[PDB]
Amino acid sequence: HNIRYHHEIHTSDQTYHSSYDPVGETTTERLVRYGYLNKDQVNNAEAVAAAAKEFQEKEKRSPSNNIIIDEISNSDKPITKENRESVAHHVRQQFEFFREVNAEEVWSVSIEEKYNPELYIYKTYDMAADDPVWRQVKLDLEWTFENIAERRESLGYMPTFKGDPNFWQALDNSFSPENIAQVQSSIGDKVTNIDTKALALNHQTEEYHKTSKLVYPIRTNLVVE
Amino acid sequence: KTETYANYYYLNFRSYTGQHGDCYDRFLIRMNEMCESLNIVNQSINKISKFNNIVSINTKKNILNKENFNRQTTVLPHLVLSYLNKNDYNLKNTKNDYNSMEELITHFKYWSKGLKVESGYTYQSV
Amino acid sequence: GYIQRSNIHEEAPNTSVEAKHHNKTFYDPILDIDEDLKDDI
Amino acid sequence: MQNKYMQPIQLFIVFEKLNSKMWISKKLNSNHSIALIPSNWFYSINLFLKRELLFSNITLIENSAIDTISYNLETNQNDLDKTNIENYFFKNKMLVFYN
Amino acid sequence: LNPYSYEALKENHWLVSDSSKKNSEWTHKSNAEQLIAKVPIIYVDSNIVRCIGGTEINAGHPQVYIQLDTRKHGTPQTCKYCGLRYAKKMD
Amino acid sequence: QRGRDYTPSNKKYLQPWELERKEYVELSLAIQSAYSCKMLSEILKDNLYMLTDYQLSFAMFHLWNHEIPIDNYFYNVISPILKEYITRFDRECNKSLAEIATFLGRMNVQDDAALWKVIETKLVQERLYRYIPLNDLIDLAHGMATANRGSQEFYNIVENVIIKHRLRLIPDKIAVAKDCFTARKIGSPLLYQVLENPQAEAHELAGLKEHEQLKIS
Amino acid sequence: KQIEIFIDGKPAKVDDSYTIFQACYENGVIVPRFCYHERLSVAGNCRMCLVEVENVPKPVAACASQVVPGMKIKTKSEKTRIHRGNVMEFLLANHPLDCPICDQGGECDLQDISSVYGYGISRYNEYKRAVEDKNYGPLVATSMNRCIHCTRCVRFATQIAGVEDLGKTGRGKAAEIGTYVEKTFNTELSGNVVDVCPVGALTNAPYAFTSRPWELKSFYTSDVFDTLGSAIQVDTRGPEIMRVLPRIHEEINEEWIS
Amino acid sequence: SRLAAHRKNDDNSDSVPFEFTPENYKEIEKILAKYPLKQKRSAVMPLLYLVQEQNNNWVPLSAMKKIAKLLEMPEIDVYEVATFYTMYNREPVGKFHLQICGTTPCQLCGSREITKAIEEYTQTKLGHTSADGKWTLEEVECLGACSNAPMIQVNNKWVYEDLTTENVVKLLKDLESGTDKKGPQNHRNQVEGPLGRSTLKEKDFLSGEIRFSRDFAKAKQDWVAQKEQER
Amino acid sequence: GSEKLIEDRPYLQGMPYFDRFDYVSMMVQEHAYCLGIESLLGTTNYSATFTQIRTMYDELTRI
Amino acid sequence: LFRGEHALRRYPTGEERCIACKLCQSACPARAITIETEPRPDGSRRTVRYDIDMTKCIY
Amino acid sequence: SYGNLKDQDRIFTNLYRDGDPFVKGALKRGDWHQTKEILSNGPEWIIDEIKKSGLRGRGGAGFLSGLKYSFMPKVNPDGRPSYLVINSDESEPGTCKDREILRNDPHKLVEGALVVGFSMRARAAYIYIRGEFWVEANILQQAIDEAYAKGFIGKNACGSGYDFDVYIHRGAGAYICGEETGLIESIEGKAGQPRVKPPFPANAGLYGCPTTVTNVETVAVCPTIMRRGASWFASFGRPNNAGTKLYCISGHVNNPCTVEEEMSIPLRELLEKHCGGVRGGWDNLLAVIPGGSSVPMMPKNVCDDVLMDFDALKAVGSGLGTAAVIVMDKSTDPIDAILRLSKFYKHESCGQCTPCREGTGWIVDVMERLLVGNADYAEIDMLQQVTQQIEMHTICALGDAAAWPVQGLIKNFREEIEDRIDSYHAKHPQLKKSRKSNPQI
């Protein structure tokens, strides 16, 4: 009776965008391209400073900053041609990532595996025997089979689903027994239980389908005489 | 870590590689992978199995249900699903298209025009 | 969606004899002769 | 996205005359990143990828193309944002993608 | 009883009727109309009757409800999924 | 996750639908994979902000099913989490409460007296036993009897509930309940008669008139 | 007077004459509806257009609510989702399971809105309402169990045409839209009743049981049976033609055909 | 008050005549005068009440059509009004249309017992009309005199309160005879409780003339002065 | 023209093309297609994950 | 669950269970099902032509 | 200390018929006194006097009557008249106060209608009376005829020269007609289906003209407070409340009746003094649903200290509604009582909006199954959620009225429902759950 929240309100469909200007461009070139600074005004230091101030005020980032948007990582350190220390910082970050990404792997990389190799050697007819794990797999499978057999033998029989042609009556039990019998007679059904009292007993009754029993031990029927 | 797509990442199995890149090594790898698929299947089936059972205090022996389905078998596929997603399992097993208007509408739409998929690009590998 | 892990290594199951789930016959000296052939270039 | 990820900004640091347009989404794997590359620089960029130190161990998994000329948002048209990659499909004759 | 008469059309929902029910053998490639016409009208005490086309859910057609409280007493109503016709047991 | 707040909307306990399906499934898989108390505690503490009562009960079931030994790591890390979650439970957490209590009893954790006290207060003092299914209630009583923990009030409550729902008793549950009560030595002649013949008549089972007069809920 | 409002935090400008639904449609955000029709009067019966406003505790019916300065509308909020789900659940309660047999299977806005906005499963497990069918002539087939009592049919008959025959007779869940007496709806514009009816309660009898929407190819053409000329859409499944419909042409057709 | 449409009856066909008497026409004129000249559509309910009074406590379809024609309004509107309002019997009823309240107050006071007694005395079930056209039982909602429950209403006109398993039978016999008590069958007054009054016990004040005089001119002057001072 | 036919057909009706792509890994092909669809949808098949079918049958198909 | 040869069933009364909803036609990946339906004289929603191209159908 | 109102401070004198209810007795007891001067005072003075007195609506809303009247337009340039509708329709369960003034002091109601109409600048006042009150409608019509004959109403009302016409509309049985918009539509002649409320019917209501809907009790008490001063009425109630109110007790009480009493009187004192208390004593009390059926119930735990005030009842969670108190004893079944209430609401639903027109029937079916006992524990929370979905999603506030009693029962007597479900399931084992719909009852 709890249908609210059936649909997943929280989903795993999320995207992030990172856009940067060319690292080759200088502050003056960036200002000229964006239009804040006129092409011929680059010489005038005062004009360049005014254009930089306007750019910072309007676009919410310094002209030196190369990051238009960094939703991916929100990095506050731009990489530019002018600041040569940015290249060194990025190189250090790249090598840090190269170490850490491999470190966090569980199976892909392992220096312990590199320096202590573990080999599988084919040396016997049974390839399972060469591996302790596969021998245990065989033993576990046989143990499971034996446990299932023991449980079933102790129970002594097996319930089974038995087809019942009366499951396909024209009318439901919710209808009157007289109506059910009349419809069955009209459709000429003679292999179904149309007893009025039985139908009345089953009226508005919910119960499981017909079941039979398979009785152990399983043996072949024979005509010995 | 970043590319697992099923229960594999939480199963303890082994993958095999050869120091010779020849047909013989490839054949050995295929044989070993066939053998290890058995171990993976065994682990997967065990993940949905009820091995333990109620033990009587007086006799310290198992109390097996005589007229319960769980006595026939030790593997119950719906075990974890029922245990964790109880509401979803109940809705799935109680509401269908023959008695629920919403289920009928979903069935009709599903089989007339497939489910709507939001626009986007994906690359998924196995 | 993902989860956070603190111990990447899955430590080996306890090898003590007293501890439960101990298999005395897991290793066979006659069969587990890998070490002899392991050091072979 | 609970993994250690870094953008492939080396390409755009080296090719200093190109602008960067990169994406990552949960629709993809945690370690998967999309980028826009101009055709006139595609060959040189692949030359750099094939022999750069950290990009040396790189394999071209896949390559194909999309006929973006007839691409239209059939549902949720208003939800499109200027940062989405779909904005580059409209009015462009073709879009060839490598992975 | 002309099938094309106004009275016949109004009674049969402006469709040309086939009293013999034999034309369907060719039109729809079946005698199901003849077979279903044999079943008599099922009389139900309640004003509203529930039909599932069988004994259990998913063994027939989707569960539907038919109003037997017709503006004219005793008028049979036919189920849309199956041709079974139900009428109220006026007393 | 980015821009995600895991504080429960109910302000009592987190729910599975609040978390992303991927996170829920992956944490459940990790819990299932855990094969020792140490690693299970590590996983639970690392992902505590995403942990749910369903997953905690499932972790207890996994420990019981695989007979993972209970040790110092359990009693020192897992037990506080169980105490906190059980205290924060309410009526709608009947499934988790019954499962956790039953599996702790079956595992026979004879320590964590505070944990057992919290479980008892939730079960009887707060009258949360009325939301436990009859079969689940019988299994919980049997498990607590196996652990040897319990209260006379709780056992009397279970006996009265069994007598009330004698008609719904299944033979397997009857056997389990009879074993539990015989082992504990607690019981009544009316209870034993009901267990022997659940479908007996009112005059067949002497004392049912007094039980009905008591009118146990 | 131009007025600034916010839709999901997106600034927008609309004159005060606009309603919430009209402002949303102009700005490109879709709102479900069952009873609101552009050319018909305004009614707030179905209440499927409920949205969330920051300063309004109760849900606001977008169709019959005028915009206010500074209004903060949250159409993507969880509260709006819950409102849509509740209304859809109430609508689907008592709704017959006639999708396979209903002629509007592929053109049912109720199905579409239930898939996109409402919940995916129903809780109502009880006897549904049952309504007797009505005879409106050889042009309109009526299956009144599928009626949602949105009165679009009544409004069209009283407003677009001069015929005054349809009405909501009764009170409560037993209310029945239609003619109290048994008579045929013989207006020259009876065809458009099927188009306005959104839940397949009224359908095209000649076209009944013929085909499905997803297997038709549509062509825009002009009518010739009347010297007025009408912008029509012709749907064909191969050589066979079927289901001629109107298409919007306000200068000549004004959305209706004879 | 069963179906939301026209029931196919031979005695309620369109051919059934109906004509207002001259007194009814005068009453209709008075009703129209009371209502606005243009808004003649508001006189549907009084017209339906007049039709019920003129007929055997029911509104024929022909009468409804006549009302629509007189009011210059669609017949569908009259149909909607008649179907929406349940006090209009669209089909013939019995000589006594008993209407037993069944809301929670009456239910607590024992409405079910009174209903069973009425059914036993009238030899008919709830809702169904008796074989002979004499009794018609119906269950209705709060009739207003909750404090005097249980209660019934006859012909939508006369209310009988404070009924019991024997008072109701006595009331039914009195109705059949022709002469019966109007109001509660107990000894209580209109709303006075069975035990007695708890208020208004002072007979002197109630009987004597009650006068309350206020210096309205002075009050108005004071209000204006206060308003000016605030200004 | 399997890709062309998949584009012509809706999502569900294109799945059996993935069975046809590989005659011995059809389960894995279906798994990849369904994984892509659910990645677009932003959800995961918790039912399959908890029932373990998508791993055991993938390994059976590998065998 | 084996899928062998297609067949059309009937209700126990003998009436056809097929109502021309064309859901099967739309879902058929191979476009192997062709359905045309006309109202039956009694008024039932029953198909007049229901063809399955066994050579074009993937089982 | 609140209660024990003096017999000489009761506005509704002759509540129990002891004198003539017609013009003779009305003038004997002081009706139609200085009406000319009251009119001459001016509409602004009347509005200010009401505001100072603090009279608030006697219906469910409880809004400030003075402010409600002041909201009406001063003048209509288009020439549209203003209408004063008196909603005498009393169809809410347990409410009897309204009918006890129509047949006792109709002239007081007519005088109040005239005063309010003059204050509001309204040419016509229509008294809409439910068709059940046939005798009361006849009495009020006779009173109106007497007023016209004596010249109080009509041309030169009370010699003031202000033309004012009082008409009577005897509607039929529809509890929905009590709603303002539904009342207006019923007067218009359409179906009593409420209307969405962005137009604020005070601006465009009846016939498209400004109309104001007011309760009979408020209209009747207006002239008396006008004559006796605003301070008099304001001093007979707790602060922020109006004053003397006409309560009516219906449920299991020794002496059911309708009595006028001071505002804020304790519920226990009101039950014990005027009506003799519960049948088996206060200890035998099970619950009380004061202020009509619409508002939730109150258990004996809170009934002890609750005061009959709008604010106090709102804080406790069971509004004062129409001052209709139904006392449910330990003999009755709260589930059955609320089931009957839900059936009443289902019957009375106009049917315009799907939330109400479907949830009412759904709740009725769920309550019926709960009463039978063939229901699950989760169905209680499902019913709670269904009521929360109905509320605030409707147009006329009838969905909320139908939802509130069910929520009150769920929160108060959850254990009773759970015990009944357990009792049913103990005697009715059922392993298999049917996928079919629940059988019709």
Ligand SMILES: Cc1cc2nc3c(=O)[nH]c(=O)nc-3n(C[C@H](O)[C@H](O)[C@H](O)COP(=O)(O)O)c2cc1C
């Ligand atoms: C469903 C419903 C029924 C109502 N029934 C009545 C009623 O019977 N009598 C009444 O006076 N007010 C009733 N009201 C309230 C009126 O609409 C309105 O608020 C009141 O009559 C105005 O007078 P007041 O301002 O003094 O409360 C009902 C409201 C609703 C939503």
Ligand SMILES: Nc1ncnc2c1ncn2[C@@H]1O[C@H](COP(=O)(O)OP(=O)(O)O)[C@@H](O)[C@H]1O
């Ligand atoms: N037939 C069953 N089918 C599916 N899951 C079962 C079944 N029986 C037990 N489980 C699981 O066993 C756990 C309960 O353990 P236990 O009390 O021993 O079983 P039971 O009471 O049915 O004999 C639950 O996780 C429950 O889901």
Ligand code: SF4
């Ligand atoms: S309108 Fe037709 S297709 Fe839509 S839900 Fe109703 S019956 Fe199904």
Ligand code: SF4
């Ligand atoms: S028949 Fe169709 S258009 Fe008319 S009220 Fe019902 S749903 Fe609306």
Ligand code: SF4
């Ligand atoms: S058309 Fe196809 S899906 Fe529809 S009923 Fe017939 S066989 Fe079934």
Ligand code: SF4
């Ligand atoms: S809430 Fe109910 S009574 Fe009010 S308008 Fe909607 S359907 Fe009519």
Ligand code: FES
């Ligand atoms: S579209 Fe808003 S109420 Fe129907």
Ligand code: FES
């Ligand atoms: S309960 Fe009978 S009149 Fe109100």
Ligand SMILES: [Mg+2]
């Ligand atoms: Mg168990």
Ligand SMILES: [Zn+2]
């Ligand atoms: Zn059927």
